[PDB]
Amino acid sequence: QNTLALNIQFYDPKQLLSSVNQSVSVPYFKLCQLFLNKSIELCTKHYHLKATDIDVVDEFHAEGATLAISTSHPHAVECLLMVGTVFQLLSDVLYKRYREDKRFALQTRSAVCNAVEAMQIDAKEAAQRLAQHLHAKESALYLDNEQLKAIQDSYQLVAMPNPSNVMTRHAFMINGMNAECAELAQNIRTEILMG
C-alpha cells in the first residue's frame, strides 16, 4: 500500500472518558488536534513536505487520532515519527499544566506502523492495534526492514515488554533518540509553545 500510519490514544486507566462532560472533552480533543496540526506543519516543513502530504484520517476523539502518509514522499518515515515525538512532548506539557489546574486531561501513547504482512492488516489498523497495548507517554513502531535502517540511527529501539499478542511480538518500543533527533524535536516543541 506504500502507507505509514500514526495512531495516538489516550491512556485512561480510570475510564474517565466514560463519564467526562461533553463541555470539557470537546475543547480538550480540539486542543490536542490543534497541537497535532502544529506538529504536522513544522515537521513537514523541516522535511520539505506540505502539511497536506499527511492525511488526517481521524481527528482527535475519545478513541484517539490517526494520521497517514504515503511512503512515496521522501523522509516519510522520519517525518511521521517526528510528528509523533513532538506531539508526545506537547501532550506531556498540556497534561502537567491541566493537572496542576485541576482540569480534565489524559496522557497519550502513540504508534507508527507500516502494513503487517504476517497479520495481513494495513498500516492504519496496525498502528491502532499497537498503540492500544502501550502505557502512558510510550511510543512504539512496526516498520519493514528497509524503513528500520532509515531510522535505527535516529531512534533507540528495544523489544516490547512481556508481549502478549502478535502485534506486540513484532513491534519495537522507542526507548530514546540520538542527539540530532532530540535537538530537532525540542526546537519544534519550543517554536509551537513560545509564540
mmCIF file of all heavy atoms in Angstrom, residues 148-172:
data_model
loop_
_atom_site.group_PDB
_atom_site.id
_atom_site.type_symbol
_atom_site.label_atom_id
_atom_site.label_comp_id
_atom_site.label_asym_id
_atom_site.label_seq_id
_atom_site.Cartn_x
_atom_site.Cartn_y
_atom_site.Cartn_z
ATOM 1 N N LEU A 148 13.325 0.376 8.831
ATOM 2 C CA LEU A 148 14.093 0.343 10.106
ATOM 3 C C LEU A 148 15.493 0.935 9.889
ATOM 4 O O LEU A 148 15.906 1.769 10.713
ATOM 5 C CB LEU A 148 14.192 -1.094 10.630
ATOM 6 C CG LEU A 148 12.974 -1.633 11.372
ATOM 7 C CD1 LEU A 148 13.185 -3.092 11.748
ATOM 8 C CD2 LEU A 148 12.684 -0.804 12.620
ATOM 9 N N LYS A 149 16.189 0.528 8.822
ATOM 10 C CA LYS A 149 17.562 1.044 8.570
ATOM 11 C C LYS A 149 17.554 2.579 8.523
ATOM 12 O O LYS A 149 18.469 3.187 9.109
ATOM 13 C CB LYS A 149 18.129 0.471 7.268
ATOM 14 C CG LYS A 149 18.329 -1.038 7.249
ATOM 15 C CD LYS A 149 19.033 -1.531 5.999
ATOM 16 C CE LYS A 149 19.285 -3.024 5.992
ATOM 17 N NZ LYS A 149 18.022 -3.799 6.021
ATOM 18 N N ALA A 150 16.543 3.175 7.888
ATOM 19 C CA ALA A 150 16.444 4.647 7.729
ATOM 20 C C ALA A 150 16.249 5.381 9.065
ATOM 21 O O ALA A 150 16.433 6.620 9.059
ATOM 22 C CB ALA A 150 15.312 4.970 6.785
ATOM 23 N N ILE A 151 15.906 4.689 10.162
ATOM 24 C CA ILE A 151 15.663 5.433 11.443
ATOM 25 C C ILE A 151 16.345 4.770 12.647
ATOM 26 O O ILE A 151 16.300 5.399 13.719
ATOM 27 C CB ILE A 151 14.153 5.648 11.711
ATOM 28 C CG1 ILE A 151 13.350 4.344 11.715
ATOM 29 C CG2 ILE A 151 13.561 6.654 10.737
ATOM 30 C CD1 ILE A 151 13.647 3.426 12.873
ATOM 31 N N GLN A 152 16.953 3.584 12.517
ATOM 32 C CA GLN A 152 17.569 2.973 13.734
ATOM 33 C C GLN A 152 18.766 3.802 14.217
ATOM 34 O O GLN A 152 19.178 3.589 15.371
ATOM 35 C CB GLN A 152 17.962 1.503 13.548
ATOM 36 C CG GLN A 152 16.776 0.547 13.610
ATOM 37 C CD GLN A 152 17.135 -0.774 14.248
ATOM 38 O OE1 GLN A 152 17.883 -0.829 15.224
ATOM 39 N NE2 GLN A 152 16.556 -1.851 13.743
ATOM 40 N N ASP A 153 19.287 4.712 13.384
ATOM 41 C CA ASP A 153 20.421 5.586 13.793
ATOM 42 C C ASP A 153 19.869 6.832 14.499
ATOM 43 O O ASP A 153 20.647 7.496 15.215
ATOM 44 C CB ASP A 153 21.288 5.978 12.594
ATOM 45 C CG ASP A 153 21.914 4.795 11.871
ATOM 46 O OD1 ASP A 153 21.676 3.647 12.303
ATOM 47 O OD2 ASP A 153 22.630 5.029 10.880
ATOM 48 N N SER A 154 18.578 7.124 14.303
ATOM 49 C CA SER A 154 17.910 8.312 14.901
ATOM 50 C C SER A 154 17.220 7.939 16.218
ATOM 51 O O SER A 154 17.253 8.753 17.158
ATOM 52 C CB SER A 154 16.912 8.910 13.934
ATOM 53 O OG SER A 154 17.566 9.536 12.840
ATOM 54 N N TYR A 155 16.611 6.754 16.262
ATOM 55 C CA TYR A 155 15.862 6.279 17.458
ATOM 56 C C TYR A 155 16.529 5.043 18.063
ATOM 57 O O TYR A 155 17.115 4.247 17.316
ATOM 58 C CB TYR A 155 14.412 5.967 17.081
ATOM 59 C CG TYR A 155 13.645 7.189 16.657
ATOM 60 C CD1 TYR A 155 13.663 7.619 15.342
ATOM 61 C CD2 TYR A 155 12.957 7.952 17.582
ATOM 62 C CE1 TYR A 155 12.980 8.758 14.949
ATOM 63 C CE2 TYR A 155 12.275 9.096 17.208
ATOM 64 C CZ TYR A 155 12.284 9.497 15.885
ATOM 65 O OH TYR A 155 11.608 10.621 15.509
ATOM 66 N N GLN A 156 16.444 4.928 19.390
ATOM 67 C CA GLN A 156 16.971 3.773 20.164
ATOM 68 C C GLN A 156 15.780 2.838 20.358
ATOM 69 O O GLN A 156 14.814 3.261 21.027
ATOM 70 C CB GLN A 156 17.554 4.248 21.495
ATOM 71 C CG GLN A 156 18.645 5.298 21.334
ATOM 72 C CD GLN A 156 18.816 6.123 22.587
ATOM 73 O OE1 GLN A 156 18.397 5.731 23.675
ATOM 74 N NE2 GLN A 156 19.419 7.291 22.436
ATOM 75 N N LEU A 157 15.815 1.667 19.726
ATOM 76 C CA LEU A 157 14.674 0.723 19.775
ATOM 77 C C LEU A 157 14.980 -0.481 20.661
ATOM 78 O O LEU A 157 16.135 -0.979 20.643
ATOM 79 C CB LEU A 157 14.371 0.271 18.345
ATOM 80 C CG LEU A 157 14.095 1.386 17.341
ATOM 81 C CD1 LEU A 157 13.809 0.803 15.967
ATOM 82 C CD2 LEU A 157 12.941 2.273 17.794
ATOM 83 N N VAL A 158 13.971 -0.922 21.406
ATOM 84 C CA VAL A 158 14.077 -2.137 22.262
ATOM 85 C C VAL A 158 12.837 -3.003 22.006
ATOM 86 O O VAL A 158 11.835 -2.484 21.500
ATOM 87 C CB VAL A 158 14.223 -1.786 23.755
ATOM 88 C CG1 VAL A 158 15.480 -0.966 24.022
ATOM 89 C CG2 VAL A 158 12.996 -1.071 24.296
ATOM 90 N N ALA A 159 12.910 -4.278 22.368
ATOM 91 C CA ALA A 159 11.749 -5.181 22.208
ATOM 92 C C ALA A 159 10.641 -4.754 23.168
ATOM 93 O O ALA A 159 10.902 -4.150 24.208
ATOM 94 C CB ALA A 159 12.184 -6.604 22.471
ATOM 95 N N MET A 160 9.395 -5.057 22.786
ATOM 96 C CA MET A 160 8.231 -4.750 23.601
ATOM 97 C C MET A 160 8.274 -5.570 24.891
ATOM 98 O O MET A 160 8.733 -6.705 24.881
ATOM 99 C CB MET A 160 6.971 -5.052 22.788
ATOM 100 C CG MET A 160 6.839 -4.211 21.552
ATOM 101 S SD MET A 160 6.342 -2.379 22.046
ATOM 102 C CE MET A 160 4.595 -2.501 22.915
ATOM 103 N N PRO A 161 7.788 -5.035 26.037
ATOM 104 C CA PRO A 161 7.842 -5.755 27.313
ATOM 105 C C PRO A 161 6.704 -6.772 27.507
ATOM 106 O O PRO A 161 5.563 -6.418 27.247
ATOM 107 C CB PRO A 161 7.728 -4.610 28.335
ATOM 108 C CG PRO A 161 6.829 -3.590 27.645
ATOM 109 C CD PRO A 161 7.156 -3.713 26.168
ATOM 110 N N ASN A 162 7.045 -7.987 27.960
ATOM 111 C CA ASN A 162 6.061 -9.081 28.200
ATOM 112 C C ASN A 162 5.012 -9.090 27.089
ATOM 113 O O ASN A 162 3.815 -9.049 27.367
ATOM 114 C CB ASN A 162 5.393 -8.941 29.570
ATOM 115 C CG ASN A 162 6.351 -9.135 30.727
ATOM 116 O OD1 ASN A 162 7.252 -9.969 30.664
ATOM 117 N ND2 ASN A 162 6.142 -8.396 31.803
ATOM 118 N N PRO A 163 5.417 -9.194 25.801
ATOM 119 C CA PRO A 163 4.464 -9.161 24.689
ATOM 120 C C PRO A 163 3.406 -10.253 24.896
ATOM 121 O O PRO A 163 3.796 -11.349 25.227
ATOM 122 C CB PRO A 163 5.333 -9.396 23.445
ATOM 123 C CG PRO A 163 6.582 -10.066 23.978
ATOM 124 C CD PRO A 163 6.791 -9.454 25.348
ATOM 125 N N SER A 164 2.125 -9.945 24.644
ATOM 126 C CA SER A 164 1.027 -10.923 24.879
ATOM 127 C C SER A 164 0.276 -11.244 23.580
ATOM 128 O O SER A 164 -0.614 -12.115 23.629
ATOM 129 C CB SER A 164 0.075 -10.399 25.923
ATOM 130 O OG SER A 164 -0.550 -9.201 25.479
ATOM 131 N N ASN A 165 0.628 -10.584 22.477
ATOM 132 C CA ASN A 165 -0.096 -10.819 21.199
ATOM 133 C C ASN A 165 0.875 -10.629 20.031
ATOM 134 O O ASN A 165 1.954 -10.048 20.241
ATOM 135 C CB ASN A 165 -1.331 -9.922 21.111
ATOM 136 C CG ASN A 165 -0.977 -8.448 21.141
ATOM 137 O OD1 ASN A 165 -0.351 -7.941 20.217
ATOM 138 N ND2 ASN A 165 -1.406 -7.744 22.177
ATOM 139 N N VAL A 166 0.445 -11.022 18.832
ATOM 140 C CA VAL A 166 1.324 -10.971 17.627
ATOM 141 C C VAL A 166 1.776 -9.539 17.335
ATOM 142 O O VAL A 166 2.933 -9.328 16.984
ATOM 143 C CB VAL A 166 0.646 -11.616 16.404
ATOM 144 C CG1 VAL A 166 -0.722 -11.020 16.112
ATOM 145 C CG2 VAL A 166 1.541 -11.546 15.177
ATOM 146 N N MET A 167 0.891 -8.550 17.480
ATOM 147 C CA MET A 167 1.290 -7.176 17.191
ATOM 148 C C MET A 167 2.425 -6.728 18.113
ATOM 149 O O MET A 167 3.388 -6.115 17.640
ATOM 150 C CB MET A 167 0.095 -6.217 17.288
ATOM 151 C CG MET A 167 0.376 -4.774 16.864
ATOM 152 S SD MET A 167 0.778 -4.451 14.942
ATOM 153 C CE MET A 167 2.602 -5.144 14.688
ATOM 154 N N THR A 168 2.324 -7.032 19.415
ATOM 155 C CA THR A 168 3.364 -6.598 20.335
ATOM 156 C C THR A 168 4.607 -7.485 20.178
ATOM 157 O O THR A 168 5.716 -7.005 20.528
ATOM 158 C CB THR A 168 2.851 -6.493 21.781
ATOM 159 O OG1 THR A 168 2.301 -7.742 22.204
ATOM 160 C CG2 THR A 168 1.805 -5.405 21.926
ATOM 161 N N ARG A 169 4.452 -8.720 19.688
ATOM 162 C CA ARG A 169 5.669 -9.567 19.490
ATOM 163 C C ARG A 169 6.485 -9.065 18.285
ATOM 164 O O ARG A 169 7.686 -9.406 18.195
ATOM 165 C CB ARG A 169 5.303 -11.040 19.310
ATOM 166 C CG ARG A 169 4.834 -11.711 20.592
ATOM 167 C CD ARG A 169 4.709 -13.202 20.413
ATOM 168 N NE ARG A 169 3.595 -13.585 19.556
ATOM 169 C CZ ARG A 169 2.365 -13.849 19.989
ATOM 170 N NH1 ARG A 169 2.076 -13.758 21.278
ATOM 171 N NH2 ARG A 169 1.433 -14.222 19.128
ATOM 172 N N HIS A 170 5.868 -8.281 17.406
ATOM 173 C CA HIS A 170 6.529 -7.747 16.176
ATOM 174 C C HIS A 170 7.067 -6.322 16.354
ATOM 175 O O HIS A 170 7.984 -5.931 15.601
ATOM 176 C CB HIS A 170 5.538 -7.715 15.003
ATOM 177 C CG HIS A 170 5.363 -9.035 14.321
ATOM 178 N ND1 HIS A 170 4.507 -10.003 14.785
ATOM 179 C CD2 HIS A 170 5.913 -9.527 13.189
ATOM 180 C CE1 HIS A 170 4.555 -11.052 13.985
ATOM 181 N NE2 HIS A 170 5.404 -10.782 12.994
ATOM 182 N N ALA A 171 6.533 -5.575 17.311
ATOM 183 C CA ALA A 171 6.899 -4.142 17.395
ATOM 184 C C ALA A 171 8.177 -3.875 18.218
ATOM 185 O O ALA A 171 8.775 -4.814 18.818
ATOM 186 C CB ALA A 171 5.716 -3.402 17.959
ATOM 187 N N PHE A 172 8.637 -2.624 18.141
ATOM 188 C CA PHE A 172 9.768 -2.115 18.957
ATOM 189 C C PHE A 172 9.299 -0.896 19.729
ATOM 190 O O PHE A 172 8.568 -0.069 19.191
ATOM 191 C CB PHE A 172 10.960 -1.711 18.092
ATOM 192 C CG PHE A 172 11.634 -2.893 17.453
ATOM 193 C CD1 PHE A 172 11.241 -3.339 16.201
ATOM 194 C CD2 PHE A 172 12.610 -3.599 18.140
ATOM 195 C CE1 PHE A 172 11.844 -4.451 15.632
ATOM 196 C CE2 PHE A 172 13.215 -4.704 17.566
ATOM 197 C CZ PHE A 172 12.823 -5.133 16.317
#
